[PDB]
Design a binder for this molecule. Structure first.
Ligand SMILES: Nc1nc2c(ncn2[C@@H]2O[C@H](COP(=O)(O)O[C@H]3[C@@H](O)[C@H](n4ccc(=O)[nH]c4=O)O[C@@H]3COP(=O)(O)O)[C@H]3OP(=O)(O)O[C@H]32)c(=O)[nH]1
Ligand SMILES: Nc1nc2c(ncn2[C@@H]2O[C@H](COP(=O)(O)O[C@H]3[C@@H](O)[C@H](n4ccc(=O)[nH]c4=O)O[C@@H]3COP(=O)(O)O)[C@H]3OP(=O)(O)O[C@H]32)c(=O)[nH]1
Ligand SMILES: *[C@@H]1O[C@H](CO)[C@@H](O[C@@H]2O[C@H](CO)[C@@H](O[C@@H]3O[C@H](CO)[C@@H](O)[C@H](O)[C@@H]3O)[C@H](O)[C@H]2NC(C)=O)[C@H](O)[C@H]1NC(C)=O
Ligand SMILES: *[C@@H]1O[C@H](CO)[C@@H](O[C@@H]2O[C@H](CO)[C@@H](O[C@@H]3O[C@H](CO)[C@@H](O)[C@H](O)[C@@H]3O)[C@H](O)[C@H]2NC(C)=O)[C@H](O)[C@H]1NC(C)=O
Ligand SMILES: *[C@@H]1O[C@H](CO)[C@@H](O[C@@H]2O[C@H](CO)[C@@H](O[C@@H]3O[C@H](CO)[C@@H](O)[C@H](O)[C@@H]3O)[C@H](O)[C@H]2NC(C)=O)[C@H](O)[C@H]1NC(C)=O
Ligand SMILES: *[C@@H]1O[C@H](CO)[C@@H](O[C@@H]2O[C@H](CO)[C@@H](O[C@@H]3O[C@H](CO)[C@@H](O)[C@H](O)[C@@H]3O)[C@H](O)[C@H]2NC(C)=O)[C@H](O)[C@H]1NC(C)=O
Ligand SMILES: *[C@@H]1O[C@H](CO)[C@@H](O[C@@H]2O[C@H](CO)[C@@H](O)[C@H](O)[C@H]2NC(C)=O)[C@H](O)[C@H]1NC(C)=O
Ligand SMILES: *[C@@H]1O[C@H](CO)[C@@H](O[C@@H]2O[C@H](CO)[C@@H](O)[C@H](O)[C@H]2NC(C)=O)[C@H](O)[C@H]1NC(C)=O
Ligand SMILES: O=c1ccn([C@@H]2O[C@H](CO)[C@@H](O)[C@H]2O)c(=O)[nH]1
Ligand SMILES: O=c1ccn([C@@H]2O[C@H](CO)[C@@H](O)[C@H]2O)c(=O)[nH]1
Ligand SMILES: *[C@@H]1O[C@H](CO)[C@@H](O)[C@H](O)[C@H]1NC(C)=O
Ligand SMILES: *[C@@H]1O[C@H](CO)[C@@H](O)[C@H](O)[C@H]1NC(C)=O
Ligand SMILES: *[C@@H]1O[C@H](CO)[C@@H](O)[C@H](O)[C@H]1NC(C)=O
Ligand SMILES: *[C@@H]1O[C@H](CO)[C@@H](O)[C@H](O)[C@H]1NC(C)=O
Ligand SMILES: *[C@@H]1O[C@H](CO)[C@@H](O)[C@H](O)[C@H]1NC(C)=O
Ligand SMILES: *[C@@H]1O[C@H](CO)[C@@H](O)[C@H](O)[C@H]1NC(C)=O
Ligand SMILES: *[C@@H]1O[C@H](CO)[C@@H](O)[C@H](O)[C@H]1NC(C)=O
Ligand SMILES: *[C@@H]1O[C@H](CO)[C@@H](O)[C@H](O)[C@H]1NC(C)=O
Ligand SMILES: *[C@@H]1O[C@H](CO)[C@@H](O)[C@H](O)[C@H]1NC(C)=O
Ligand SMILES: *[C@@H]1O[C@H](CO)[C@@H](O)[C@H](O)[C@H]1NC(C)=O
Lengths: 743, 737
């Protein structure tokens, strides 16, 4: 049984974030990939891996976690098959000397390396990917980056070079022509000469973002080119970049795009022009002629500060972008979207996504979207429609790359996102002349209206409706029923009226949906309903009821809600967490749908749980009771269940395991007992279980512990994670140490 | 040193201490004993034997999480006046309670039988509480009141019987009564005989008898066919001294004016939760109330009905003494000027409350034409551009409608929890001279520009919390020259977004601004001006923001973010995720500070030597962090520090000399840390140590010795200052060795 790492085959040794002080000498001979990131390793020497000649990869990132990792000349030199070596965030002062010449990936992102030397690098002929980003940047106290002449020239298999967020001042000379991707973002390069990318006939990606940056409102310390000038790109800079697919020129202070940049660039797929000053160019846009194969165009945050124009001015020459799939125009900042303003786009055959987030737009003429060929995502979030390093070095710096629309919503069809606006009620004609919308997000519009069964009549086929973070007033039982096809409904965070005991709350409308599969009512603080105390639906499969007040609903002095979930005949998944529950009336538990396969009651305050009532739940596979105050287990659990696969009891107050509880239920694969109060496990508990969790428990590590230890050896198919977290509370000398390490 | 209680001046506070039974170590000299919320299971004549000067006993909520009392167990207690036995699941009144009893509370038990044997022996009772013994869907018997049981109680002033099944006003009540409480007692009928003889009654509560049950937040049984309570027209005839009358939720559709004939001093009339819409618009009984100060007609809405207007009878103009009119939940669309006519000449009408009416429009000019409103309460409308506490009102909350700190300044207008998502140019035309304005929770997303409040320029307290304000203009709120308190908490919406502007410059422009709250805005980036500046400002709350990011190691722009706050005495930096504070950032905090909070962050280290630049610093709060050790040189860094809070850190060892370092140091909190000892080595008035894991061997004795030799050093919760080790000491307070 491996220690300290968790070893598997897919041979990986997961060994991260385990407070290891030195490289463990206890790693299998057979491991090919070792991860020791986020540990406290302070030294590496020609000893540190002596056992492990079959190592293809070592991750040593972020050591030591909260001064600097200390690597000896040739410490890795003995590792003949070492391919990928990650050394990020290790406060290195130089590139380690004597690296094995077999390397293909080297990463030194986020260290203190300001000298890139032949001695360090030139001998590594097999390097494919080399990452030196983020060594000198912002107001980090650091030197200008010295790149020794010809250091890269010998790297003739190098496909990816990244030097971003270093002070370079000039594109380094003598780059090998093997290069496919070249990242030089935020490098302080003012000027790009015809010579800089001369040879690079294989380049597919070039990133010159952040050189001559647009600094207004920068969320980082930002230094403009003198006068706020744009980057200066020679007319012929890109001449031989025939294979370029991706070009990032975000925040280079462009007022003018040169069309001839693109003359020899027939395969260009992505042009990123965020954070420039391109309002003028968006109105003119000759360069657009040059880009009929472009799929993605990001023109976000090019606004003129202070200027809030009536309309957006889009060149007719947008019509020429025949391959365009997505257009991003956040942050142009304009008051009104009129049908004609988007004419140049209405015939683009493959234009699927339009993103106008964050434009402070007050009005939109929605009939305009109809006229589009093929829109699948209309993203209008964040407008004014009405009735220890801050930046991840492995992320895009200029936007977020999460999907615009949850995938679960977009699978249903056309998507319209009106989240984070001011649509505080939906009027009669609000959704008029819209397309057949299937996925609709109205989250956080502070919508306080009484829905009544007509508001979505124009878009009756909505299948996924996100109404979270509003303040909806449920005083009408026809609400939403115009949506016969509704499958998913998200009503989380509409507490506003639910908190007020004296106003009606009608949730009757739920029964009227033929196809409703998932319903989210979390964080609504539900403690009182009007007239009908029961949730009913023949359809519903999942109910999420976390963060309401079942403590008040199932209070011992009130019977009204004793069956609140019973009418949910089709239910398999129920979540009752964060309901302040101290106990559940037996009658109320036995009234939970008998169809349940998955029940969560975690993060309440349960002192007692009545295990026997499980008998009314033949199909129950998973039971989550984490984060309650549970004191003991039943000793005959298999009397009460034959289905239970996963039982979670982390973070309770269990001090004893009953007689043979390990082998109590055959069906139990996964049992979680971590962060409880076990000081041992007697032979008593001995007499299909894949995983058993035990970390956090205060173990008494005397010879009383030997029974279980023996058990661990006799059942190595029972996985016990985090063995370094399965710790002796006592005795004094054994305190801190893993139970697994003492004789 | 008292144990296990904390004795004061002579009051033994001994509640919530996990006591299995009454402690036998109670100071013999104690008057009041609090043992509420322990796990006590039995009381005998043995329990309180040694204590004879007992005025009062509290044993509520025992055992907490079945209180057996023996007959006559309290008999030996010759001076016992007050006895609290709430929430003990008693099956009967206990027998043999002493005669000296002036106050008995038996709220929340299982007592269904009120007996002479229990009660009639208690000649001296002023106050008797028997409420909440059988109610709702509790399994309980109808309540038996033995005939005449209260007859002998001729000093009885308060009798509370609410929330029990009575069905009739028990007969034969001592005429001493000032206050009779009979809410939710299932009494359909009030006869002429029921009160007749109670000539000193100032208060009568008949609420919840024949309840209005629609949308009730509790299991609710109406009288047959929604019928009203039946009150005999001479039922209140000899109730000449009545000041408070509660008829909430009695299903009244009609009020008999003549109930108020002999009652010309009624001050409070509660008519919540009935059906008095017609009565409100006709209302002869409004003539019979010339001294009435507070009238509550809330929640008399007709369900479904949502009328254009509110119909207020002319006769409201006879309510000459009216100070506060509560008209929640009438439910209607539009408040016109003509509709509040009757109200305009009432000289003392200071408070008008229309919360929760779903109102869409108001003619704000109508409030001018009143004689002297101090409080216009319009929260929770549609304006645009055991569950229950047995010591609270059942039908409304009793907290001030407007926070006292805001009302203190003058006329107040509360428009919270509406949909005023921007303030238009006339939103505040025709208003009185408002001094306190609440616009919280309106989802207002506007760019304030220094003109929106011109029509009410003397606002001194402005609550704009829970909005989504867009700070894109340095002149925001600058028309309010008199502004003293500005609360902008919970306006994260746009501060989240790196790409839009965030202009806080406007703050320097106020001569008289004292308090600024910017909590929970997740502020991490600001536009152009990176500094907060004010000559006047005295307190800044900045909790719930991102100083971890503002003060990041690779950015210098915010290193002086608070320096320009030259007059500042209180600064809150809690909940900012700070793992460490740059030294140059700390030194840049205003030197005027007297109080600094940096609790609930994640600090591993603290540069104590930095305290030399803060010579007026009295309170330093570092609770809920990850500090691993204290300086050993504190005397050298500060001579001003009185309170030092380190609760909930990871401190393992107390530095030699620490306990006698500092002269200014009154109060030191080290509860919930990792102290195993306080070795001999290590103005002091209080020292908190509960929650630490002490080694309870002989090493500990030097500290015990220390405790004895300094009784002037309070150490609360000694019950909770527990041993972790060794195995035979685990569990035991460190005094009990
Ligand atoms: N460019 C951009 N993208 C944003 C923005 N806000 C959200 N996003 C989303 O990032 C996601 C990643 O976009 P990004 O353009 O940064 O990177 C793309 C594009 O550069 C590129 N791509 C993607 C699609 C395509 O048709 N052609 C193409 O070249 O492949 C990357 C991987 O993204 P994937 O599409 O596989 O998730 C997109 O998923 P999205 O359709 O929901 O809108 C995108 C934003 O402001 N700008
Ligand atoms: N009656 C009533 N009061 C409500 C309601 N909602 C909030 N409140 C507030 O609770 C508070 C308590 O009022 P309530 O009528 O329940 O009880 C009063 C009144 O019954 C009575 N009183 C108060 C003032 C007075 O002039 N005359 C008078 O008889 O003494 C009690 C204590 O008041 P306090 O000392 O807390 O101000 C008031 O302080 P408030 O001015 O903000 O408006 C009140 C509500 O819906 N109804
Ligand atoms: C400028 O524009 C280009 C957009 O083409 C950006 O390149 C993209 O950079 C991200 C972040 O490093 C890369 O994503 C990462 O990819 C690796 C490898 O597959 C994976 O380990 C990470 O988790 C993450 O997915 C992405 O590959 C890359 N795009 C392409 C086509 O290679 C560039 O980041 C932009 N520059 C800045 C500063 O925003
Ligand atoms: C309201 O509850 C719904 C339903 O539970 C939440 O949406 C669901 O969120 C879960 C994860 O939180 C999604 O499951 C995940 O699927 C992904 C991708 O396939 C998988 O990688 C994850 O391990 C996980 O299984 C689930 O698909 C999603 N369901 C739907 C229908 O969208 C929702 O987040 C809740 N709303 C709020 C505001 O919290
Ligand atoms: C019916 O209306 C009357 C209006 O007076 C309400 O009477 C009030 O009842 C509350 C609830 O206990 C009393 O509050 C208590 O005041 C005493 C003062 O010594 C204090 O010790 C308690 O902690 C508690 O705060 C309040 O005094 C009382 N008002 C008067 C003038 O006595 C009554 O509660 C209403 N009934 C229901 C069921 O809501
Ligand atoms: C925004 O910050 C202000 C200033 O901290 C908060 O208002 C202040 O709230 C405290 C209590 O948290 C008040 O002090 C308390 O006063 C009461 C009554 O005098 C007293 O009983 C307490 O012992 C304590 O002294 C303080 O007066 C009050 N300040 C003002 C100017 O009203 C405010 O609550 C914060 N807002 C939010 C939404 O968190
Ligand atoms: C509806 O719009 C809201 C608001 O933008 C989306 O909420 C975001 O969701 C992502 C992923 O769930 C989170 O990481 C963000 O934190 C959320 N933002 C906020 C402000 O809450 C929501 O996901 C959208 N719904 C769908 C179905 O796409
Ligand atoms: C402004 O309006 C809101 C209306 O809710 C008040 O916020 C409430 O404050 C009370 C008293 O502190 C709290 O107990 C409530 O929980 C708060 N409710 C909400 C929804 O936040 C606020 O106090 C009012 N401000 C002033 C100055 O009176
Ligand atoms: O927007 C509105 C308008 C009126 N009502 C009415 O107010 C009462 C209490 O909520 C109910 O009868 C309901 O009809 C609402 O709930 N919401
Ligand atoms: O409501 C608005 C309208 C426009 N802008 C403008 O948008 C840009 C980014 O915030 C800035 O120039 C600002 O003037 C806003 O910030 N908020
Ligand atoms: C790191 O360790 C090496 C030897 O292992 C030593 O020569 C060197 O001085 C150390 N450097 C630091 C800064 O610890
Ligand atoms: C673009 O849309 C056309 C139809 O207008 C379709 O034939 C073609 O397959 C689409 N192109 C891609 C790459 O999806
Ligand atoms: C629901 O609202 C509609 C629209 O006004 C109305 O016709 C209907 O009567 C309402 N139904 C209920 C349950 O009140
Ligand atoms: C909703 O379903 C119920 C049947 O349970 C029915 O009474 C009602 O008319 C339905 N309303 C709509 C709009 O489908
Ligand atoms: C029950 O749930 C299943 C999904 O597992 C679904 O196919 C079916 O429609 C549901 N039953 C009814 C009556 O809707
Ligand atoms: C109004 O209040 C004042 C001051 O408390 C009081 O003296 C006066 O009698 C009241 N006026 C009336 C008409 O009740
Ligand atoms: C703030 O907005 C007002 C109103 O639009 C305008 O007059 C003023 O110039 C603005 N001030 C700033 C700081 O831009
Ligand atoms: C606020 O004060 C600053 C300088 O202290 C000044 O620049 C600005 O014009 C002032 N604004 C207003 C609206 O008074
Ligand atoms: C500083 O605060 C104190 C107390 O509020 C006050 O006396 C003084 O006016 C303030 N100073 C200035 C310059 O506003
Ligand atoms: C504390 O700050 C002072 C002043 O900057 C500095 O001299 C000292 O080194 C700091 N000490 C620690 C513990 O960092």
């Amino acid at each position: 049984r491996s220690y300290p790492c968790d070893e598997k085959k897919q041979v990986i040794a997961e060994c991260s974030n385990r407070r290891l002080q030195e490289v463990p000498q206890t790693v299998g001979k057979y491991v090919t990939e070792l991860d020791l990131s986020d540990n406290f390793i302070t030294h590496i020497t020609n000893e540190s891996f002596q056992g492990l000649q079959n190592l293809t990869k070592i991750n040593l990132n972020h050591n030591p976690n909260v001064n600097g990792l200390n690597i000896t000349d040739g410490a890795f030199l003995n590792l003949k098959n070492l391919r990928e070596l990650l050394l990020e965030d290790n406060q290195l002062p130089q590139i380690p000397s004597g690296l094995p010449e077999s390397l293909t990936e080297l990463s030194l992102i986020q260290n203190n390396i300001y000298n890139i030397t032949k001695e360090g690098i030139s001998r590594l002929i097999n390097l494919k990917n080399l990452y030196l980003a983020w060594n000198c940047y912002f107001n980090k106290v650091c030197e200008k980056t010295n790149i020794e002449d010809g250091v890269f020239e010998t790297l003739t298999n190098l496909e990816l070079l990244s030097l971003s967020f270093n002070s370079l001042s000039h594109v380094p000379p003598k780059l090998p022509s093997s290069l496919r991707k070249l990242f030089l973002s935020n490098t302080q390069i003012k000027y790009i000469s015809e010579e800089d990318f001369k040879g690079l006939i294989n380049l597919t990606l070039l990133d010159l973002s952040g050189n001559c940056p647009r600094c207004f409102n920068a969320p980082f310390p930002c230094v403009p080119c003198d006068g706020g000038a744009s980057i200066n790109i020679d007319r012929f800079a890109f001449q031989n970049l025939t294979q370029l697919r991706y070009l990032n020129l975000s925040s280079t202070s462009l007022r003018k795009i040169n069309a001839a940049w693109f003359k020899n660039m027939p395969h260009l797929k992505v042009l990123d022009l965020e954070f420039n000053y391109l309002v003028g160019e968006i109105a003119s846009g000759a360069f657009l002629t040059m880009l009929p194969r472009l799929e993605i165009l990001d023109l976000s945050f090019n606004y003129i500060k202070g200027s809030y124009p009536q309309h957006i001015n889009i060149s007719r020459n947008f019509s020429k972008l025949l391959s365009l799939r997505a257009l991003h125009l956040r942050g142009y900042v304009f008051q009104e979207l009129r049908e004609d303003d988007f004419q140049p786009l209405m015939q683009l055959p493959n234009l699927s996504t339009i993103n106008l987030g964050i434009n402070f737009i007050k009005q939109i003429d929605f009939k305009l979207f109809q006229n589009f060929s093929n829109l699948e995502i209309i993203y209008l979030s964040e407008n004014r429609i009405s009735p220890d390093f801050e930046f991840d070095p492995h992320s895009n710096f200029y936007h977020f790359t999460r999907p615009l629309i949850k995938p679960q919503c977009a699978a249903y069809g056309k998507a319209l996102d009106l989240s984070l606006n001011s649509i505080f009620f939906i009027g009669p004609n609000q959704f008029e002349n819209l397309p057949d919308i299937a996925c609709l997000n109205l989250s956080a519009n502070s919508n306080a209206q009484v829905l009544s069964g007509t508001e979505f009549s124009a878009i009756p086929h909505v299948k996924y409706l996100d109404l979270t973070n509003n303040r909806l007033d449920f005083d009408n039982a026809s609400a939403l029923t115009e949506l016969s096809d509704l499958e998913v409904l998200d009503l989380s965070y509409n507490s506003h009226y639910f908190r007020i005991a004296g106003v009606t709350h009608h949730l009757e409308f739920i029964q009227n949906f033929t196809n409703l599969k998932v319903l989210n009512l979390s964080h609504n603080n539900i403690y009182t309903l009007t007239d009908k105390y029961n949730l009913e639906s023949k359809s519903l499969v999942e109910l999420v009821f976390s963060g309401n007040r079942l403590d008040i609903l199932w209070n011992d002095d009130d019977n009204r809600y004793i069956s609140i979930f019973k009418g949910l005949k089709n239910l398999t998944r129920l979540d009752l967490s964060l309901n302040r529950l101290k106990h559940i009336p037996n009658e109320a538990f036995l009234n939970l749908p008998a169809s349940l396969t998955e029940l969560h009651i975690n993060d309440n305050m349960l002192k007692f749980f009545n295990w026997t009532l499980l008998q009314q739940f033949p199909r129950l596979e998973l039971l989550d009771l984490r984060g309650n105050k549970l004191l003991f287990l039943t000793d005959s659990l298999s009397d009460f269940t034959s289905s239970l696969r996963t039982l979670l009891l982390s973070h309770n107050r269990i001090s004893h395991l009953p007689s043979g509880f390990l082998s109590e239920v055959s069906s139990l694969k996964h049992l979680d007992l971590s962060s409880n109060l076990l000081k041992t496990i007697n032979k008593s508990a001995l007499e299909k279980l894949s995983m058993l969790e035990l970390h956090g428990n205060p173990f008494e590590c005397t010879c009383d512990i030997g029974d279980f230890r023996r058990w661990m050896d006799e059942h190595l198919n029972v996985k016990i994670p985090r063995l370094v977290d399965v710790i002796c509370a006592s005795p004094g000398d054994q305190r801190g140490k893993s139970i697994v390490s003492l004789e």
